[PDB]
Design a protein around this nucleic acid. Structure first.
Lengths: 128, 126, 37, 176, 136, 69, 138
RNA sequence: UACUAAGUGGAAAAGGAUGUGAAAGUGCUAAAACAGCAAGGAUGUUGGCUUAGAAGCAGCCAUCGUUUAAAGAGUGCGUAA
């Protein structure tokens, strides 16, 4: 089993996903209409390796590992944590942590904020 | 060391005494993903999920004023769902998990200290 | 099965055996094994 | 450890007698014979439902004896009560085998006929032309016999064609 | 490569490396060090090979110090000549080390890469090297 | 999950309903015809509601009694 | 030839291409025991010749493979069931369709590229090519 | 009284080694320590340069956090990632 994260504009791209045993048009249409509200953006998908493989695919909300750049109003995710790239208000960071609290091992907003700080460590900008 | 072992035995024994409900169940190929799923099912719930040392477990249930002195805290990956404080939600969730898989290995314990079979538990909780 | 004069474990498996009182270095791969190294 | 390795005895039919050079093990699967080396500082005492061996001195080689003779006794017991077997998968195109009497002859890659003799206590059976089962009487005999069978041809990293032991895997090498 | 400035005499005694450490008899500037278990002579080429080995395995930082500087020089008598016409022709410079002499010290990128670099340095010289750590 | 099962046919179009059972996933003539010859036969399972909705749409466009969840 | 597995070919054709190729005739033997063909349109035809085809041995269809025919038979007419409704009515009735009728149906299918027949044989053994010529003419 | 396993003795080293034996220590454990085994060995997360992708892990640069008893931007093998 592998992890995948691709554009939400269309599920047609991806030959590895179509070769699992699921019809191309099937997941293409299904994903494109399940993201019809908001598409044309990067979304992380998850699927399993099943034998029948009719449809065992689901999506997840927008990844938050370098997504703080969206909150930081900048791009070009830094390789090294040597200098800071910008500032993010703590209110937005905590609101996003709560927004992703249910997803992960974090059980309170504080633990999700700790994980946000941990993934922001590499970026060079911390929870400020 | 063993002094810390005894101190933790006393602490968990007191916790078991004040939280009269506690049930221990083991399950095969305990995977991390399913452990996370069941733990998230008990969201904001006092019950703890782990595996503790068999020696410290048997010492704790010896000093815990609980049913048995050393009976089943051996021979298997001793999954422990330490029921803490309110254990009705915990009882229902762990029993639903028991029925979810093929069969969960009933190790020991009860919902408030007075052992009855799990078939009786699933019906009294209802 | 190489011949050297200074054996040092290159791969994960570079074990030795003094088999029949003769030292052979063996590896899980057929290349990293040695002889009288 | 193995210096402390208890071997349980089943006196139902498996009975052991000691000659200090010949240990005979009677059981349902015929009889096992162990050639005890001469002048051993190790006493192999049989008792009720258990077998205990102990050195009468303190020597480096005595510990190796303690491990090895315990291992031999365990192998003898398990062989005389259950035996051993191997499954061989002969992966080939025209490769196949068939037995006449005690001579297993082969259809393999040589233009020359292939024949091999089958030792006693090693019962071979060829269900399909490309699969073989070899139920041996001892792990030594069956292992050595399987090595003799495979020594003719072995699978290659470029292509797997030969006598696989049904538990091994190959790697892929580029064949241009 | 590393030679003195001026030589009042170019022709000293042949050389003897006997004796114990007289100067630089210890490590006094690094954190790890290398000691020679036998008195030998280290010429310019081997010294530079060791130095470039240390430089390559040093990474980006790392502090290194040699306890000596190549001072002595050697002479080569002409080949295919009969016995006795003077002394030899001046040749390469060289440094003398005595039995039990600490020659080299390292710091900056600690003991793991320190020992790796020390082995890299010592694998270029005939001396049976010995690794030590400077104690504070 | 929501599935759809075909009940008693309409127009008695054995050929047409056989083609309908074929178009689901590209199944062959033999298995599809054997499935059609049995009046109760599941078309497909483990599918999202939308594609099952189009499946039922074809089934009611052709004409037959339809059983769904 | 070694590696010439009938199942391998009849599965690989559909896996790589999926052209609905219909295997008509069944061989007798696997690369060493190759000794004839189990004809679908007619009765079995044994070929003892290991080369230089001269005679074809007409034999009844082997008993152990009658069902092997029937299933494919129950498919073959079914495979040409995409041409007319009366053929489907006969299939529902179970009534056999004339061999000439189904032969012409397969002819229309192959000329129209609806499907394509598959036959078996060995060039180095020269078995069953007369059947190929008969099919080509028909 | 200790050593030998090489006929060392009975020629040589750069070198390397769970070779043997002894000594000086340093920790845990009979509750059963360690080896092996039955397993798990997880998430934010496919962090970014970039290989007409950075994705755990060609490499390079950072080189954290959450639950857990356990999990390291991972320990490595290995894959086009």
């Amino acid at each position: 089993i592998a992890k995948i994260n691709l554009l939400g504009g269309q599920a047609k791209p991806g030959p590895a996903l179509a070769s699992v045993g699921i019809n191309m048009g099937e997941f293409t249409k299904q994903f494109n209409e399940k993201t019809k509200d908001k598409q044309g953006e990067m979304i992380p998908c998850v699927i399993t390796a099943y034998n029948d493989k009719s449809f065992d695919f689901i999506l997840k909300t927008t990844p938050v590992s370098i997504l703080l750049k969206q909150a930081a109003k900048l791009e070009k995710g830094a390789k090294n944590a040597k200098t800071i790239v910008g500032k993010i208000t703590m209110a937005k960071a905590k609101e996003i942590a709560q927004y992703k609290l249910v997803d992960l091992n974090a059980n309170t907003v504080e633990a999700a904020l700790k994980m946000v700080l941990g993934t922001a460590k590499q970026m060079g900008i911390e929870v400020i | 060391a063993k002094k810390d072992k005894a101190q933790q035995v006393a602490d968990v024994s007191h916790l078991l005494s004040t939280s009269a409900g506690f049930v221990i169940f083991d399950y095969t190929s305990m995977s991390a993903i399913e452990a996370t799923s069941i733990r998230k099912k008990l969201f904001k719930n006092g019950s703890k999920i782990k595996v503790i040392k068999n020696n410290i477990l048997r010492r704790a249930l010896k000093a815990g004023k609980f049913e048995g002195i050393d009976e089943t805290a051996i021979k298997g990956k001793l999954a422990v769902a330490v029921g803490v404080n309110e254990i009705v939600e915990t009882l229902k969730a762990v029993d639903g998990v028991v029925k979810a898989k093929e069969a969960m290995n009933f190790v020991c314990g009860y919902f408030d200290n007075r052992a009855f079979n799990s078939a009786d538990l699933e019906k009294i909780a209802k | 099965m190489k011949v050297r004069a200074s054996v040092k474990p290159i791969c994960k498996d570079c074990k030795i055996i003094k088999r029949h009182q003769i030292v052979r270095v063996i590896c899980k791969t057929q290349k990293h094994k040695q002889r009288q190294g | 450890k193995i210096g402390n390795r208890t071997i349980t005895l089943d006196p139902a039919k498996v009975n052991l007698n000691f000659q200090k050079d010949h240990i005979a093990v009677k059981g349902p699967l015929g009889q096992i014979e162990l050639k005890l080396p001469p002048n051993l500082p190790l006493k192999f005492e049989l008792k009720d439902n258990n077998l205990q061996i102990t050195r009468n001195n303190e020597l480096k080689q005595s510990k190796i004896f303690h491990g090895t003779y315990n291992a031999l006794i365990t192998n003898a017991i398990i062989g005389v009560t259950q035996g051993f077997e191997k499954k061989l998968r002969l992966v080939g195109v025209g490769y196949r085998a068939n037995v006449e009497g005690e001579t297993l002859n082969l259809q393999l890659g040589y233009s020359h006929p292939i024949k091999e003799k089958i030792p006693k206590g090693l019962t071979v059976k060829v269900e399909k032309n490309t699969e073989i089962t070899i139920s041996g009487i001892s792990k030594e005999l069956v292992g050595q016999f399987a090595t003799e069978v495979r020594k003719w041809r072995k699978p290659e990293p470029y292509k797997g064609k030969g006598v696989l032991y049904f538990d091994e895997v190959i790697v892929r090498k580029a064949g241009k | 490569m590393l030679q003195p400035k001026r030589t009042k005499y170019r022709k000293p005694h042949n050389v003897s490396y006997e004796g114990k450490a007289k100067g630089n008899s210890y490590v006094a500037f690094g954190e790890y060090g290398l000691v020679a278990t036998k008195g030998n002579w280290i010429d310019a080429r081997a010294i530079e090979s060791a130095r470039i080995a240390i430089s390559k395995c040093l990474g980006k930082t790392g502090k290194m110090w040699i306890r000596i500087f190549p001072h002595m020089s050697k002479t080569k008598k002409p080949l295919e000549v009969r016995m006795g016409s003077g002394k030899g022709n001046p040749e390469f410079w060289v440094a003398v080390v005595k039995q039990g002499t600490v020659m080299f010290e390292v710091a900056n990128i600690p003991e793991s890469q320190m020992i790796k670099a020390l082995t890299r340095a010592g694998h270029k010289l005939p001396v049976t090297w010995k690794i030590l750590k400077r104690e504070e | 999950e929501v599935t759809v099962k075909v009940t008693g046919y309409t127009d008695n179009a054995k050929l047409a309903v056989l083609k309908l059972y074929r178009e689901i996933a590209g199944v062959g003539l033999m298995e599809a015809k054997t499935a059609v010859e049995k009046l109760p036969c599941v078309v497909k399972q483990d599918i999202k509601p939308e594609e099952a909705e189009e499946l039922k749409k074809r089934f009611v466009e052709v004409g037959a009694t339809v059983e769904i969840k | 030839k070694t590696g010439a597995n009938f199942e391998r070919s009849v599965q690989s054709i559909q896996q790589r291409l999926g052209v609905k190729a219909v295997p008509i005739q069944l061989p007798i033997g696997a690369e060493n025991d190759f000794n004839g063909i189990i004809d679908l349109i007619e009765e079995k035809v044994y070929f003892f010749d290991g080369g230089k085809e001269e005679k074809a041995e007409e034999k009844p269809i082997p008993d152990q493979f009658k069902d092997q025919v029937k299933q494919m038979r129950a498919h073959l007419v079914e495979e040409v069931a995409n041409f007319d409704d009366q053929l489907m009515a006969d299939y529902l009735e179970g009534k056999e369709i004339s061999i000439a009728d189904i032969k012409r149906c397969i002819r229309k299918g192959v000329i129209g590229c609806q499907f394509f027949p598959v036959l078996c044989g060995s060039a180095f053994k020269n078995k069953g090519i007369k059947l190929l010529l008969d099919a080509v003419v028909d």
